[PDB]
Design a protein around this ligand. Structure first.
Ligand SMILES: CCCCCCCCCCCCCCCCCC(=O)OC[C@H](COP(=O)([O-])OCC(O)COP(=O)([O-])OC[C@@H](COC(=O)CCCCCCCCCCCCCCCCC)OC(=O)CCCCCCCCCCCCCCCCC)OC(=O)CCCCCCCCCCCCCCCCC
Ligand SMILES: CCCCCCCCCCCCCCCCCC(=O)OC[C@H](COP(=O)(O)OCCN)OC(=O)CCCCCCCCCCCCCCCCC
Ligand SMILES: NC(=O)C1=CN([C@@H]2O[C@H](COP(=O)(O)OP(=O)(O)OC[C@H]3O[C@@H](n4cnc5c(N)ncnc54)[C@H](OP(=O)(O)O)[C@@H]3O)[C@@H](O)[C@H]2O)C=CC1
Ligand SMILES: [Zn+2]
Lengths: 123, 334, 125, 484, 117, 82
């Protein structure tokens, strides 16, 4: 037969929110645990605390989503991502997509008020 | 969507009366409207500067000497952004062809040893004089001239002496040129710095590795150069780009050893013996440590009291201790 | 009513649902043709962005674009379906209500009506 | 001819701005330039037709364009950056030091409502009330008043012409001011009995008209005469007043006579039918009046030290003081830009999604076909930025906030494609037309034609080679256009 | 010869390469960019390049203007631009041209001019 | 106000009836009372009776005119003008 691969979890939509939050916290713990493995695999310049900070931000972004089905989908995609990272399927190029802030300063002019945006036709 | 991070605004007017209108969001397919000639573009710093310039689609004219050394520069720009011109310092028409159509001219041409064809004078003073004459004759809007830190006319070192003379002749010819003096630059595959410390059989100093300078990341020098390129308020100013904190050569070697998990071999020799050795090895065809380099091994960095710095470009240099691991990673062995 | 940002499971950029406006409408009867086959579907397409719509390459003279939606246009069977879709994606929209030809009775015999007074115009056929 | 094929054209539904009718058009563009303009059906405005100017003046949008800011230095303009321009405006403002009504603002025939709103708000925040229109006598307030919409609109809808039994045209030539409406009047006249009379210049009409004279006295005679009786008896009468009469100094007398006649005759103005109609010629006049873009009484007395032209290409040498600092904001190079000290490029009607209010008072929304050329910008953004440089920063920096401010100014700007009749029909006439116009003395000067040349009336139309060729090809004294 | 650039500097071009075609000096369509303008706008990519090697095909407008007018008896001239030597259909679609008006009337496909005599 | 007053009101709405009456009857009295202010009456179906006053340098203020009587409309306006 075709058997599942490493860190594969069968797709299951939780019927109750609480049973989903259990899995969600497990997944968060897995990501935090794997952070050093990610730092070794992908030869990152930045520190393990920064990996963990990024993970916390990612989990934070959906902290107020209510409808259960959307939470189920987000959890499934988060697990798919975890499996992608931990198995070194991803390369450094795609991994660093997650990390747009640690790249250097892109330039002198990042407009913030209406006059600087207007001068660059981005108002 | 992307953004023209280097440009302050959309419509621009060069000092020469050209109207430049940036098109597009600011990505590969966009065009800033500027045209720039980068002398010495295929070198260590020129490559980064060219990558930053062609990232936003300003036309980059690259004068080159060897065809095979410049090939990596074509990748950095869209079709027709990076243009290549055959050039030689003893062919005036070639220089004229290189600078003729540009709004910006920066020259990074400098050599840390002497050759059978170009001695320090020929490469730093007469070369700069010819480039600056082409600039003045074609009335180029912006001319940026890069020299070295510690550039002084009456220096012990022929390198610093010729650099100071080059600065003087540039100022005499083009009164509106901008002079930059970067500190020792490090970074990936640098020259006579970190990479040398990482794979040398032995580093031999004639002055106990005591010399102090503020090393600066090459990316930061290139970004500062770009900023100087695109703001017209830096005309006729002098810039002293240097790193945050002052280091001793021995300190850097100790940091490299700690980051390399391997001990770097240091041997101290008398100055006369090491001179004779370097003067002897100057007979081979591949670049090797100069006699004047070891002369410079007795000069510590001197920062001009009255000179614009990274702060005036709203920039903050990165730290050499922070990059260490990123900059020397392939030699750890572990 | 409208799906907020960051619970859309499509994966599209946030800018799409933040600062872009789509328009929903029916195509107008083309003035050049009498056929009406294209006028029943409810199109949905994006209003253009000023800086990123189209510029001219300085080499071969082509139309460069930074707007990734300039060519996209969805078809829907009905106005309510288009509204529901745009709402489910979080897109700000505007509805352009269609215009139709007002019915009037046309008689061929009207071309030959007797005129009791002076002729207002000479019909010619 | 031969410039494109239908499958490669991007089709955008937008609004024509050549006249004040507000024809609905489809803009076919490929890439960065506009190919053609074709009509789309709106049975309540243009039916399925547009006039030749609206169709063929598109070629004026790709020539004589403004692309970079310009600054006058000596007797020549020099290109300059947006920052340099706007800082020059700020420095001229601080040096001139205008107090109150010394900052004049003029709006041209083509501009959108959002741009007018921005300009008026900024000018008010400078302490000025000198928000003028571009027409002759536009330094003064209009004689028909601004308080009620029905004072300056086509109160009978454009579809109202279908029901007409009698029409009196006062100082207006619809064939030139509103061509599709002229076709509408013609169709009505062909298919039912209908009586048309006019006061004003002898006009070549597609329908039989009765000429009652060229003078205000002739209007008095008519309204007291046989045609006044015809209007009294009519079931759906309507009186059409040209915008060209509003531009006369004696506009008060005409508006007074007409208001008295209307307030008398119930057929002309009852609760089911308002026969009083003003026919604007410019696409922007209705919106301007809607937001109160009208100078104050004391403003017309002052001599401005700074003038801001928004469009404003009908301006003369006389209306600008020599010492004034003039800012021009537009999309084409015309006489107005020639007069300026700083020129700012703004988007054209095909390059922005604006609101236009037609003669009916109908509010319509356009859609941007292409982006502005060069370094040109959206007009209300220009005003917002310059106001920030002037220290009077406008409270909105986003299109939705712009629509909110528009809702604040009037609730009918945000209701699109909707006409709703006025409940104040009887109050408006008395309060605005007959009330304050008692003192005005009618002149003895005869009424003249409002527009000398139908084909060239705007900046776009004067920038078009096609309109130039059409004007010289379709001249009356050319035998190709005679018949006999 | 000497075209001033946007820089204010001078660009020198031989006279032969400013002609739009070898046989015609000036443009033949309003939107067509003249050689002078081409160089002014692309001079960076034309440096150290040999202009005599560039394509420069002949302007067909003059070549068709050198072909003599064909006189026809009737009111209609039929043209299809066929190749009587080779097989197959090698011309352009067969159209008929009315020649009652004064002067020569050009084939819409090939430009060959006809006249009624 | 000193410079501008704007009246918003529905045409058919019941909540606008005191507004329609106030306009229809004392619009002339209000205009003559404040001869330099510019008065605008703008109507639309869905909108709730509101009034806007513009005093100086763009400062504006508004009050809701969901009111029972033409009188009460008048004192709401007067309270705005002060
Ligand atoms: C013939 C013999 C072979 C020729 C070698 C050529 C050469 O030197 O190239 C080195 C060359 C230098 O590399 P690089 O790219 O310049 O980088 C150097 C570092 O960046 C750092 O470079 P660096 O600045 O530290 O310089 C290191 C320096 C070392 O310099 C020193 O440390 C000397 C210090 C003492 C100075 C004073 C001495 C006393 C003075 C007396 C006066 C006279 O080595 C040299 O450059 C020698 C220069 C003189 C070459 C003479 C050739 C003459 C023949 C023609 O190394 C390589 O190219 C690597 C090739 C791969 C090697 C793999 C196989 C090696 C293992 C084989 C083991 C043999 C076992 C046999 C059983
Ligand atoms: C089979 C033929 C083998 C012989 C090849 C002929 C080579 C001809 C070279 C002409 C001599 C010119 C000269 O002065 O060369 C000196 C050269 C150093 O010259 P330079 O370019 O300045 O490098 C300095 C970097 N420290 O130093 C050298 O050129 C060293 C070359 C030694 C090659 C010896 C081959 C035997
Ligand atoms: N790196 C440092 O630590 C410091 C460097 N600088 C200055 O920075 C600039 C460049 O730094 P870096 O990029 O490291 O130097 P590189 O040697 O890396 O590049 C220098 C450039 O000089 C060109 N060049 C040298 N001589 C000639 C010549 N005679 N004719 C034509 N081209 C010539 C080289 O071209 P080719 O490859 O064809 O020889 C090369 O492109 C130089 O001016 C240097 O003096 C100043 C202070 C510190
Ligand atoms: Zn043919």
């Amino acid at each position: 037969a075709i058997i599942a691969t490493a860190f594969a979890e069968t797709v299951k939509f939780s019927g109750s929110k609480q049973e989903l939050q259990k899995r969600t916290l497990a997944l968060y713990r897995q990501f935090l645990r794997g952070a050093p493995t990610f730092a070794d695999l992908y030869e990152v310049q930045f520190s393990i605390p920064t990996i963990r900070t990024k993970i916390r931000q990612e989990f934070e972004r959906h902290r107020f989503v209510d409808d259960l089905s959307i939470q189920n989908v987000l959890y499934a995609k988060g697990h798919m991502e975890y499996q992608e990272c931990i198995n070194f399927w991803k390369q450094q190029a795609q991994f660093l997509k997650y990390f747009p802030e640690e790249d250097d300063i892109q330039g002198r002019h990042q407009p913030s008020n209406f006059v600087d945006k207007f001068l660059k036709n981005r108002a | 969507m992307n953004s023209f991070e280097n440009l302050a605004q959309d419509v621009n007017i060069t000092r020469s009366g050209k109207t430049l209108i940036a098109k597009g969001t600011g990505g590969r397919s966009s065009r800033t409207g500027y045209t720039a000639t980068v002398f010495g573009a295929n070198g260590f710093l020129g490559s980064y500067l060219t990558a930053k310039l062609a990232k936003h689609g300003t036309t980059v004219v690259v004068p080159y000497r060897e065809e095979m050394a410049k090939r990596h520069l074509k990748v950095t720009g869209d079709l027709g952004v990076v243009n290549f011109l055959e050039m030689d310092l003893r062919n005036l028409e070639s220089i004229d062809e290189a600078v003729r159509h540009s709004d910006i001219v920066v020259n990074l041409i400098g050599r840390e040893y002497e050759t059978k064809n170009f001695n320090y004078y020929d490469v730093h003073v007469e070369g700069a004089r010819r480039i600056a004459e082409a600039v003045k004759k074609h009335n180029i809007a912006r001319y940026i001239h890069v020299s070295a830190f510690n550039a002084e006319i009456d220096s012990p070192s022929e390198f610093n002496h010729t650099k100071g003379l080059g600065e003087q002749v540039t100022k005499d010819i083009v009164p509106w040129a901008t002079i930059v003096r970067p500190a020792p630059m490090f970074g990936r595959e640098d020259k006579w710095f970190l990479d040398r410390m990482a794979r040398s059989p032995c580093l031999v100093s004639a002055n106990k590795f005591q010399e102090t300078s503020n090393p600066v990341h090459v990316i930061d020098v290139a970004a500062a150069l770009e900023r100087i390129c695109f703001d017209d308020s830096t005309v006729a100013q002098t810039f002293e780009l240097y790193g945050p904190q002052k280091f001793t050569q021995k300190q850097i070697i100790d940091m490299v050893s700690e980051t390399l998990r391997k001990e770097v071999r240091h041997i101290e020799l008398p100055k006369a013996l090491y001179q004779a050795y370097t003067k002897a090895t100057q007979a081979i065809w591949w670049p090797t440590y100069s006699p004047d380099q070891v002369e410079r091994q007795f000069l510590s960095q001197k920062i001009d009291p009255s000179a614009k710095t990274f702060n005036d470009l709203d920039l903050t240099p990165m730290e050499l201790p922070d990059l260490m691991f990123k900059l020397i990673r392939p030699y750890r062995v572990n | 009513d409208n799906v907020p940002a960051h619970e859309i499971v499509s994966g599209a950029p946030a800018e799409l649902s933040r600062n872009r406006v789509v328009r929903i409408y029916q195509q107008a009867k083309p003035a050049t043709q009498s056929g009406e086959y294209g006028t029943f579907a409810w199109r949905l397409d994006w209003d253009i962005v000023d800086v990123a719509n189209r510029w001219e390459n300085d080499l071969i003279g082509w139309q460069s674009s930074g707007d990734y939606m300039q060519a996209t246009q969805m078809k829907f069977t009905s106005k309510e379906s288009a509204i529901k879709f745009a709402n489910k994606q979080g897109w700000d929209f505007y509805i352009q209500e269609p215009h139709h030809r007002k019915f009037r009775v046309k008689q061929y015999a009207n071309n030959f009506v007797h005129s009791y007074g002076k002729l207002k115009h000479i019909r010619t056929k | 001819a031969f410039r494109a094929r239908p499958w490669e054209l991007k089709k955008t539904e937008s609004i024509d701005v050549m006249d004040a009718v507000g024809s609905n058009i489809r803009i076919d563009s490929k890439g960065v330039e506009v190919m053609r303009v074709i009509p789309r059906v709106h049975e309540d405005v243009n039916e399925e037709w547009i006039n030749d100017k609206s169709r063929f003046a598109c070629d004026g949008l790709k020539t004589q364009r403004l692309t970079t800011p310009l600054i006058r230095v000596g007797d020549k303009f020099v290109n300059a950056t947006w920052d340099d321009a706007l800082s020059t405006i700020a420095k001229a403002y601080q040096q001139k030091a205008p107090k109150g009504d010394e900052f004049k603002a003029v709006a041209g025939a083509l501009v959108e409502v959002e741009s007018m709103v921005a300009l008026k708000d900024m000018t008010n925040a400078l302490g000025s009330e000198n928000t003028t229109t571009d027409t002759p006598n536009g330094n003064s307030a209009p004689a028909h008043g601004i308080t009620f919409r029905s004072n300056y609109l086509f109160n009978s809808s454009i579809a109202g012409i279908e029901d007409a039994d009698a029409i009196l045209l006062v100082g207006t030539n619809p064939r030139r001011e509103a061509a599709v409406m002229n076709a509408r009047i013609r169709k009505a006249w062909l298919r039912q009995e209908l009586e048309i009379a006019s006061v004003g210049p002898t006009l070549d009409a597609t329908f039989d008209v009765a000429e009652l004279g060229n003078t205000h006295a002739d209007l008095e005679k008519a309204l007291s005469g046989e045609f006044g009786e015809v209007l009294k008896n009519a079931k759906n009468p309507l009186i059409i007043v040209g915008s060209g009469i509003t531009d006369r100094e004696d506009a008060g007398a005409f508006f007074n006579t007409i208001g008295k006649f209307v307030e008398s005759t119930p057929s002309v103005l009852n609760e089911n039918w308002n026969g009083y109609n003003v026919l604007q010629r410019s696409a922007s006049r209705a919106g301007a009046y809607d937001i109160g873009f009208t100078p104050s009484d004391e403003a017309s007395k002052t001599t401005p030290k700074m003038v801001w032209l928004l469009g404003a290409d009908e301006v003369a040498a006389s209306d600008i003081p020599a010492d004034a600092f003039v800012v021009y904001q537009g999309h084409n190079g015309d006489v107005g830009a020639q007069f300026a000290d700083v020129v700012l490029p703004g988007a054209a009607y095909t390059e922005k999604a604006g609101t236009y209010v037609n003669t009916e008072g109908r509010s319509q929304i356009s859609r941007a076909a292409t982006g502005p050329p060069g370094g040109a910008r959206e007009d209300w953004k220009i005003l917002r930025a310059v106001s920030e440089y002037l220290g009077v920063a406008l409270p909105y920096e986003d299109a939705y906030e712009v629509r909110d401010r528009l809702a604040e100014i009037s609730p009918s700007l945000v209701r699109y494609d909707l006409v709703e009749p006025t409940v104040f029909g009887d109050v408006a006439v008395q309060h605005s037309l007959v009330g304050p116009n008692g003192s005005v003395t009618p002149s003895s000067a005869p009424l003249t034609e409002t527009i000398e040349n139908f084909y060239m009336t705007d900046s776009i139309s004067r920038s078009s080679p096609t309109m130039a060729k059409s004007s010289i090809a379709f001249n009356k004294d050319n035998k190709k256009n005679q018949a006999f | 010869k000497s075209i001033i650039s946007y820089n204010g500097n001078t660009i020198e071009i031989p006279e032969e390469y400013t002609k739009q075609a070898p046989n015609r000096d000036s443009t033949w369509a309003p939107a067509q960019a003249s050689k002078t303008e081409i160089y002014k706008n692309n001079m960076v990519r034309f440096e150290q390049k040999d202009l005599s090697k560039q394509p420069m095909p002949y302007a067909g407008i003059e070549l068709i203007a050198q072909q003599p007018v064909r006189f026809v008896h009737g009111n209609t001239a039929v043209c299809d631009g066929a190749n009587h030597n080779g097989p197959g259909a090698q011309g352009h679609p067969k159209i008929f041209i009315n020649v009652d008006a004064p002067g020569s009337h050009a084939c819409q496909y090939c430009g060959t001019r006809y006249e009624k005599e | 106000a000193l410079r501008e007053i704007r009246f918003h009101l529905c045409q058919n709405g019941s909540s606008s009836a005191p507004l329609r009456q106030f306009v229809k009857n004392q619009i002339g009295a209000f205009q003559k009372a404040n001869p330099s202010t510019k008065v605008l009456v703008r109507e639309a179906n869905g909108v709730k009776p509101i009034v806007f006053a513009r005093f100086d340098h763009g400062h504006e203020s508004k009050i809701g005119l969901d009111v029972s009587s033409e009188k009460e409309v008048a004192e709401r306006v007067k309270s705005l003008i002060e």
